[PDB]
């Protein structure tokens, strides 16, 4: 019953309770050296009193070499307001650029 959001929900605003966990699932292929990071370049929440985050990678069930898996970000809003979760698919030693893929979801808590 946790909200499960995927790349299709880029730009969505989800109404959520403070303390409620939201699961974001994004395609991700570690064999490229790219992964999803907060727009700033790390896996950590920009501010934990606003929302906390945990992350885990799941490889593809096919176990096929070179095949993409899925990263799961478990986000829990901790304060009322509308929180932008802004992620960017990057190689962490290069950082973002014009052609980097981005994902955003807004989490609105009362």
Swiss-Prot record:
GO terms, molecular function? cysteine-type endopeptidase inhibitor activity
What is the annotated localization of this protein? Answer: Flagellar pocket; Cytoplasmic vesicle; Cell surface
Domain statement:
The BC, DE and FG loops form a tripartite wedge that blocks the substrate-binding site of target cysteine proteases. The BC loop interacts with the catalytically active cysteine and histidine residues of the protease catalytic center.
Asked if Hydrolase is a keyword of the record, the answer is: no
Q: What Gene3D superfamilies does this protein map onto?
A: 2.60.40.2020
Instruction: Give the protein's function.
Output: Cysteine protease inhibitor. Inhibits cysteine protease cruzipain.
A Gene Ontology cellular-component term: cytoplasmic vesicle
Q: Where is this motif: FG loop?
A: 91-100
Question: Which SUPFAM superfamilies would you find in this protein's record?
Answer: ICP-like (SSF141066)
Is this entry keyworded Transmembrane?
no
- This chain's protein is named Chagasin
UniProt lists the family membership as follows: Belongs to the protease inhibitor I42 family.
User: Motif BC loop: which ranges?
Assistant: 29-34
Q: Where is this motif: DE loop?
A: 59-68
Q: Which UniProt keywords apply?
A: Cytoplasmic vesicle, Protease inhibitor, Thiol protease inhibitor
Summarize the subunit comment: Interacts with cruzipain.
Tell me the name of the encoding gene: cha
According to the record, the segments passing through the membrane are none
């Amino acid at each position: 019953m946790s909200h499960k959001v995927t790349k299709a929900h880029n730009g969505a605003t989800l109404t959520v309770a403070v303390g409620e966990l939201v699961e974001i699932q994004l395609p991700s292929n570690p064999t490229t050296g790219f992964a999803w990071y907060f727009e700033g370049g790390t896996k950590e929440s920009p501010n934990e009193s606003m929302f906390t985050v945990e992350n885990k990678y799941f490889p593809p069930d096919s176990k096929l070499l070179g095949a993409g898996g899925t990263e799961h970000f478990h986000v829990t809003v901790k304060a009322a307001g509308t929180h932008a979760v802004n992620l960017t698919y990057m190689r962490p030693w290069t950082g973002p650029s014009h052609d980097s893929e981005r994902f955003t979801v807004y989490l609105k808590a009362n």
